[PDB]
Amino acid sequence: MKQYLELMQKVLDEGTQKNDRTGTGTLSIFGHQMRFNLQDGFPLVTTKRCHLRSIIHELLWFLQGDTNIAYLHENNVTIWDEWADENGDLGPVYGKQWRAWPTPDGRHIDQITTVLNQLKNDPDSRRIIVSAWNVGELDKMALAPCHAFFQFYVADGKLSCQLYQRSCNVFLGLPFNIASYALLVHMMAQQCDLEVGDFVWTGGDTHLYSNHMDQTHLQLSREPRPLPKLIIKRKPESIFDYRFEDFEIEGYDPHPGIKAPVAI
Amino acid sequence: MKQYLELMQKVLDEGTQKNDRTGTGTLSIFGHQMRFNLQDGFPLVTTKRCHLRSIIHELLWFLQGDTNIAYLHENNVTIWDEWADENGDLGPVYGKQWRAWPTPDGRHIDQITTVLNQLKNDPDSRRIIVSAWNVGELDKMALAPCHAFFQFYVADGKLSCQLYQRSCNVFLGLPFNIASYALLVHMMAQQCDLEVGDFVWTGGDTHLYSNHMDQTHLQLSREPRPLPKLIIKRKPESIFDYRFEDFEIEGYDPHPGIKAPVAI
Numbered sequence A, B: 001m002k003q004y005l006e007l008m009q010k011v012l013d014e015g016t017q018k019n020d021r022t023g024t025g026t027l028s029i030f031g032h033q034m035r036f037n038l039q040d041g042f043p044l045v046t047t048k049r050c051h052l053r054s055i056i057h058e059l060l061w062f063l064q065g066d067t068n069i070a071y072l073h074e075n076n077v078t079i080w081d082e083w084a085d086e087n088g089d090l091g092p093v094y095g096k097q098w099r100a101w102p103t104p105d106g107r108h109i110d111q112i113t114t115v116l117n118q119l120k121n122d123p124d125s126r127r128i129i130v131s132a133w134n135v136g137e138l139d140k141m142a143l144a145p146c147h148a149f150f151q152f153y154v155a156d157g158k159l160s161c162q163l164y165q166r167s168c169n170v171f172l173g174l175p176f177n178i179a180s181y182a183l184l185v186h187m188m189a190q191q192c193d194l195e196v197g198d199f200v201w202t203g204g205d206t207h208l209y210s211n212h213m214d215q216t217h218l219q220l221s222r223e224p225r226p227l228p229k230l231i232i233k234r235k236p237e238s239i240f241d242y243r244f245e246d247f248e249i250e251g252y253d254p255h256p257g258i259k260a261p262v263a264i
């Protein structure tokens, strides 16, 4: 994608050297914002082949407030294996915060339902927010949430959403994060009889690992193809009733995939 | 400021009509990001006279974890009067979340101290975050926090900070919010022996009230003057030891002030 390649180049030309928790150096910039008009096509990277399969399962998994990787396994999705403990538990990560943020007085807040309510009864609200950054539960999470905060906005019958991503591996994670949140907006919009608007992506520490330079230069030489189109086969009863088969991507013709090895 | 006037114009030319909780219409845009190189001067609006006095007191008040307006009153600062209850209490707003985020298990997390620790012992961290968006305590706050989340970043001896502001009254509140957070960065940097870097401002629902159009056009006709310089008279023992008199602004020559009436 045009906006995507632009950021990659930006990190290359303006990034400063910084090491991550391990030892792998990164080229890093702080503060970046992109905008994807969802009406312009589904924001799935075409400069390299991306697979929607894992993305869909993870999203549906988040929505069920599940934090154990069993569901993902039943569907052969192994993107969380690396973080799961012996029992397949990841701790109170995303799904738990989204569907059951625990209060000091013993309640569990359903932020997803709260948001659905607001979009339907008070679309003009400036508080339609979902936060996964529960300070009191950070110590128990397999890892602190990267995409930690997102806000919805309604204007002229169009639902928009801004995501704040504290840490972003441009080459490996961003393509996945964009499609994931773009899917969420389509689902929410359908459930609220709204048209899709913009998906604004905001990042904090945006970076590229030093050992991904070749892959970056390679991808940057490819010309972005037209964006595909997301097809939602049916309109479920609620946001919690979507099924993997309900989605279909039309017109996706990307360039070959590109491997990105990680150090350990 | 150049970046500031640019946003005002942007809201004017691209904002859509949207009403707020009351009935006052607003011109609104969703998703905007500005960057202030703090090395370039203190980001205090010169196209209209701004008073640092209330800004400093509020910041020092936030840092003491105080949520009762008494301190502000002892110093004749009345910006919170409007929201305070009979006893001067505002509920678990900013100061409380910053200094004592309550956990489900009975602990109170000091996010400000946590951040100081990270900046000194792990400056490369991508988790140096302070959140005031405590979902479980929203119902008790006089109002949901506008500037709800901020993140620090260290690179080349420079401390940077990104603020996410969910709702932003461009004319009335933004000038205040920028200076407030810019002050925080100078204080934090001093305490960590770091140089000041960038202050990145990210907004969600950025707007202008319909009854502030004249004032907006008027301010937009003024030429931004050079930015002043922030002087910190002394280096306190800790971040919690600053005093109003410790700050001094040098070279501030703004245009006349501009009143902005609000409907009720």
Ligand SMILES: *C1=C(F234[N][C@@]25=N3C(=O)C2=C(N=[C][C]3[C]N(C6=[C][C]=C(C(=O)[N][C]([C][C]C([O])=O)C([O])=O)[C]=[C]6)[C]N32)N54)C(=O)[N]C(=O)N1[C]1[C][C]([O])[C]([C]OP([O])([O])=O)O1
Pocket (backbone or CB within 6 Å): A021, A049, A050, A051, A052, A079, A080, A143, A144, A145, A146, A147, A167, A168, A169, A170, A171, A172, A173, A174, A175, A176, A177, A179, A258, A259, A260, B125, B126, B127
């Ligand atoms: C962070 C991240 F975050 N928290 C979290 N979340 C999520 O979601 C995740 C994680 N982890 C891991 C998991 C999985 N993932 C993924 C997916 C995918 C991938 C790949 O590789 N792929 C690609 C393609 C895609 C498509 O298909 O499209 C290829 O192959 O190439 C990877 C991964 C998800 N999950 N965790 C996110 O999200 N993001 C980001 O960026 N992050 C990161 C940041 C950094 O780099 C790290 C961390 O560090 P700190 O310090 O910050 O913590 O990570």
Ligand SMILES: *C1=C(F234[N][C@@]25=N3C(=O)C2=C(N=[C][C]3[C]N(C6=[C][C]=C(C(=O)[N][C]([C][C]C([O])=O)C([O])=O)[C]=[C]6)[C]N32)N54)C(=O)[N]C(=O)N1[C]1[C][C]([O])[C]([C]OP([O])([O])=O)O1
Pocket (backbone or CB within 6 Å): A125, A126, A127, B021, B049, B050, B051, B052, B079, B080, B143, B144, B145, B146, B147, B167, B168, B169, B170, B171, B172, B173, B174, B175, B176, B177, B179, B258, B259, B260
């Ligand atoms: C929101 C806001 F927020 N939450 C909160 N925080 C704060 O901080 C505040 C509030 N409120 C009020 C108070 C006070 N303030 C202020 C200050 C100042 C001002 C003025 O007026 N001033 C000017 C000047 C300045 C200087 O000096 O510089 C003139 O005069 O002109 C005003 C105000 C502060 N505090 N609360 C913030 O911050 N911001 C914003 O923007 N916000 C807003 C948004 C909107 O508009 C509203 C709300 O709604 P919702 O729905 O969103 O909630 O508000």
